[PDB]
């Protein structure tokens, strides 16, 4: 599913991402734009043989099992295909676990380099949430 910006913001709010671990909603919308262009079916393969899955591009080495990644730990205890559904529940629950893992949202390089420190609440303006 390709979300619209405001549609995704509304969904992420419903799933309790607003100020989760202190990160206002715009952070999560910004991250999804630069990670996946709002596409839940996005996949990208990395050099270490892992793959990133879904709207927040969660990686298969540590977080989900995709049946082909060496060193797989499956910390969210999900198959990575669950991260591609039009229902973002699985991506949200796994992201909540990732952001609580010690580094906050710095785990997402695209968020670190293109979102962190910017006017992230601009990502939810015009969406009457
Ligand atoms: C904190 C921690 C936990 C909770 C572990 C393990 C390790 C671990 O310490 P860590 O500092 O990561 O050191 C390791 C490093 C750097 C590598 C490269 C390892 C392993 C470990 C050891 C072995 C290992 C372990 C696993 C699982 C599922 C795999 C696949 C696995 O092989 P793999 O990832 O290729 O090789 O079991 P599990 O995650 O339950 O337990 C064992």
Q: What string of DSSP letters covers 83-127?
A: GGSSSTHHHHHHHHHHHTTTTGGGG-HHHHHHTTTS-GGGGGTTS
SS3 content of the chain, % helix, strand, coil (to 5): 40, 10, 50
Neighbours of 45 (CB within 10 A): 11
Rounded-to-10 torsion of CA 116, 122, 127, 128: 110
What the chain holds in terms of domains, given with CATH numbers, is: 1-129 (1.10.530.10)
Ligand 1 geometric centre to CA of 71 (Å): 7
Phi, psi of 81 (to 5 degrees): -55, -25
Best substitution site from 68, 73, 74, 77 to test ligand 1's pocket, by max atoms within 8 Å of Cβ? Answer: 73
CB atoms within 10 A of CB 8: 25
């Amino acid at each position: 599913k390709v979300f619209g910006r405001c549609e995704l913001a509304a969904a992420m709010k419903r799933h309790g991402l607003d100020n989760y671990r202190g990160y206002s909603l715009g952070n999560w919308v910004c991250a999804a734009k630069f990670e996946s262009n709002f596409n839940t079916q996005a996949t990208n393969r990395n050099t270490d043989g892992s793959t990133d899955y879904g709207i927040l591009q969660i990686n298969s080495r540590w977080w989900c099992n995709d049946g082909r990644t060496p060193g797989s730990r499956n910390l969210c205890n999900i198959p990575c295909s669950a991260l591609l559904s039009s229902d973002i529940t699985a991506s949200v629950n796994c992201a909540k676990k990732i952001v609580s893992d010690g580094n906050g949202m710095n785990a997402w390089v695209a968020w670190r380099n293109r979102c962190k420190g910017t006017d992230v609440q601009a990502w939810i303006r015009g969406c009457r949430l």
